[PDB]
Ligand SMILES: COCCc1nnc(N)o1
């Protein structure tokens with residue numbers, strides 16, 4: 001494996017550890033991974049971090065009632081670019097009616113970028129992904145990790 | 152002001168805002184600013200961040216019972232280098248006997264470096280600074296700002 005490949009594997013491990021922990025605790029989270037469509041316009045709406053990824057930092061960002069927890073984290077490769085970012089809300093009718101703004105924001109950004117967004121529900125602890133305008137819900141840990149590896 | 156001056160002032164403002172928030176809520180915190188003595192060996196004991204400073208990120212690091220709040224934040228070159236770092240405990244017999252490990256850690260690093268460390272007490276919300284082996288206690292907001300600007 002090249003350094004680039006090993007760095008990706010470390011980032012994927014950090015993300016999955018954070019998501020799994022938040023899911024167990026019903027910590028709502030919204031995490032968008034930029035791909036080939038640049039997300040600068042959305043990154044610039046948040047608080048700049050440009051931080052090395054760690055599971056610890058991801059979890060801390062989303063603790064309720066803290067400055068960084070509302071809005072999206074946007075990751076660029078192996079960095080957390082910004083937190084508390086705006087994303088556009090989707091009007092798709094295929095978003096389950098009980099879901100709130102984090103899921104609608106995730107699907108929204110997925111309609112205008114090739115990004116992958118992970119959502120943790122504060123109601124249920126369920127994990128979902130938005131990509132290309134579709135929301136895939138109730139993901140097992142294994143499924144999430146495979147989706148990230150394939151991404 | 153020059154660019155470097157504006158950047159230093161912005162960092163001081165971020166620090167003081169975070170410290171004020173933590174003092175009000177009696178959130179324990181430990182924040183060491185590296186100066187001429189290199190602290191890489193201590194930075195390496197924590198979780199790497201290399202992040203832009205913001206009051207928001209500082210607060211989100213120090214949330215009680217979260218991954219990153221156990222240990223010191225170390226700042227270097229106008230960035231948060233790492234969190235949850237080890238600092239050496241002072242053996243000085245001249246620290247107020249009611250103070251515990253965060254304050255002893257701050258004094259300890261200040262005995263072997265020219266760094267400036269800020270401490271917020273979880274017991275009282277009092278703010279103190281360690282430099283040169285001494286602890287300056289019960290600081291007002293103006294006092295802490297003066298110390299940061301002098302530094
Ligand atoms: C070690 O703690 C369990 C996982 C965790 N990491 N960071 C937070 N806040 O939790």
Ligand SMILES: [Mg+2]
Pocket residue numbers: 137138
């Ligand atoms: Mg299903």
